[PDB]
Amino acid sequence: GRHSVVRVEGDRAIKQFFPAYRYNFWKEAGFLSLLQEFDFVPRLYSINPEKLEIEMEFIEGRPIKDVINELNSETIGRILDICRKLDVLGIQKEEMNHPDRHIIISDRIVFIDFERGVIKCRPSNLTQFAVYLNSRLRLMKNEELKKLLREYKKGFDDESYRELRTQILQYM
Amino acid sequence: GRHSVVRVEGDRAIKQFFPAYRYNFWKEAGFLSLLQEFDFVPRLYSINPEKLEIEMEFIEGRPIKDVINELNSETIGRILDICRKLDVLGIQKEEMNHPDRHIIISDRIVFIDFERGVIKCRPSNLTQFAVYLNSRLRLMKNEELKKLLREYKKGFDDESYRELRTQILQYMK
Ligand SMILES: Nc1ncnc2c1ncn2[C@@H]1O[C@H](COP(=O)(O)OP(=O)(O)OP(=O)(O)O)[C@@H](O)[C@H]1O
Ligand SMILES: Nc1ncnc2c1ncn2[C@@H]1O[C@H](COP(=O)(O)OP(=O)(O)OP(=O)(O)O)[C@@H](O)[C@H]1O
Ligand SMILES: [Cl-]
């Protein structure tokens, strides 16, 4: 169930939303704009509301699904850090338990696809990503995971994050 | 000390940010985009990051600074409702205690200037705007307002919004 068609021209990815998804067009544009101050989203080049088209930087890399088993704890911690950033910012990207196509890995790490984003006081980017990570790497038992995730969600502060971070990385 | 120059071509306001305020260009673009589903912001037409330009709908109306003392309580209540809507959405627009130039009034009510916005769990749109209103209309003592605004921030649900809305409007001439 897709909301858009993405084509590539030169160095740009052009995402054209179907007309029934104008709502998602604007959230994609909005959250990409609000995240330009950081290095973990594509550069945004243009919006065209009449065509529901967003033109942005094409990110060269591998999607997380193709290399998840080869990522070192270095790189996993950098991804966890980005999720924590989104949590702190108030942006619930959604589908972070299925980031398969939406984390692009090279020398850098870039997230794509913000069209389902919503603003939330306590987003679920880290906890959703943790579920995906445990499903793919089988780092621990679900109950142990929910213990750590309930601890982070209750505290939702840097201390609670640093504890959860090191605890996920230790299972690697 | 402004962050931009705004010019008008046809029915469009074109806001061009100075290069030192690229950061604010993106917040203006972002929050206008996130608010296009609502009718109280300009339509956004285009962004040009190389020029730090945003092209948007020109809003015809009178700025609130020019009509505040003549606005009726129904109209004030509509403005309060828009501040509440931003509160519920999580968008702190900032400078709502100096909205003089940034609320444009006609048959409709439209807010402009989101370049200083920030996401917050409990924004201060309504609480800042209440201070502007008390400064211009002299509704009550500063201490009374401050109690009412803390009660709103403590509750922050629809019922406690309605209470603060009523408490503010009841004092109007
Ligand atoms: N900036 C980009 N750089 C590189 N590849 C991109 C970029 N944007 C999109 N793509 C590619 O295009 C695909 C489709 O884009 P995207 O994932 O944003 O939408 P989708 O999930 O297919 O559709 P929707 O979310 O609208 O239902 C991505 O999975 C990715 O392979
Ligand atoms: N969409 C619009 N429709 C009509 N007039 C507009 C619009 N956008 C801006 N203006 C006019 O241009 C003026 C300047 O724009 P704006 O206040 O957004 O930016 P600014 O002068 O850089 O302010 P600040 O530095 O406080 O952000 C406004 O006070 C208003 O008179
Ligand atoms: Cl009246």
Side-chain angles (χ1 to χ4, degrees), chain B residues 1-49 51-140 145-172:
Chain B
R2 300 283 183 92
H3 282 156
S4 74
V5 175
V6 172
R7 74 193 186 261
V8 176
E9 299 177 358
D11 54 32
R12 283 147 82 128
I14 304 175
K15 182 172 189 173
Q16 177 158 42
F17 288 79
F18 298 113
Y21 309 110
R22 176 170 297 267
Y23 178 83
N24 302 102
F25 164 82
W26 284 119
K27 299 320 175 183
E28 184 86 61
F31 287 116
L32 284 174
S33 295
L34 292 186
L35 291 172
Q36 293 299 286
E37 68 165 297
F38 303 104
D39 62 17
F40 58 73
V41 303
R43 302 305 79 198
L44 176 54
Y45 300 134
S46 72
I47 72 169
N48 180 334
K51 287 191 196 98
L52 299 174
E53 275 179 0
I54 295 172
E55 303 203 9
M56 52 184 127
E57 180 194 9
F58 189 97
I59 312 301
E60 294 166 292
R62 313 280 292 118
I64 189 165
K65 61 175 180 82
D66 287 352
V67 297
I68 182 63
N69 290 116
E70 299 53 76
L71 287 191
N72 65 18
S73 67
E74 168 179 20
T75 301
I76 297 305
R78 291 165 57 211
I79 296 166
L80 299 178
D81 293 344
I82 294 165
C83 297
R84 168 66 181 168
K85 190 39 155 223
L86 290 171
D87 284 355
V88 153
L89 292 172
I91 296 159
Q92 179 147 305
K93 186 177 182 284
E94 298 291 1
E95 247 44 75
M96 283 301 298
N97 58 301
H98 303 277
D100 302 51
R101 302 179 292 110
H102 293 158
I103 304 176
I104 303 192
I105 300 165
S106 56
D107 41 296
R108 68 180 170 157
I109 297 166
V110 182
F111 285 22
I112 64 157
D113 206 349
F114 286 85
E115 66 175 68
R116 284 171 197 80
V118 289
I119 293 174
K120 294 250 142 149
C121 292
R122 298 185 164 191
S124 298
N125 304 296
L126 185 59
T127 60
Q128 297 169 4
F129 182 73
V131 170
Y132 171 76
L133 221 45
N134 205 32
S135 160
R136 285 337 189 260
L137 300 189
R138 280 333 162 170
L139 300 170
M140 59 185 101
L145 180 65
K146 149 135 172 203
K147 310 189 175 211
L148 274 37
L149 297 185
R150 305 181 208 282
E151 286 302 274
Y152 171 62
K153 281 294 235 312
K154 267 175 127 133
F156 216 68
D157 51 33
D158 189 44
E159 200 211 10
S160 100
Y161 164 57
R162 288 294 169 180
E163 265 313 293
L164 172 65
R165 185 184 195 277
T166 301
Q167 264 299 15
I168 291 169
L169 295 181
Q170 85 184 8
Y171 283 109
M172 289 205 53

Side-chain angles (χ1 to χ4, degrees), chain A residues 1-4 6 13 15 28 42 56-59 101-102 112-113 115-116:
Chain A
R2 249 64 164 171
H3 293 159
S4 75
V6 176
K15 186 161 184 180
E28 185 80 72
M56 67 185 93
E57 170 198 16
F58 188 95
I59 308 298
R101 310 183 280 101
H102 293 157
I112 61 162
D113 198 358
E115 63 174 81
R116 288 160 164 87

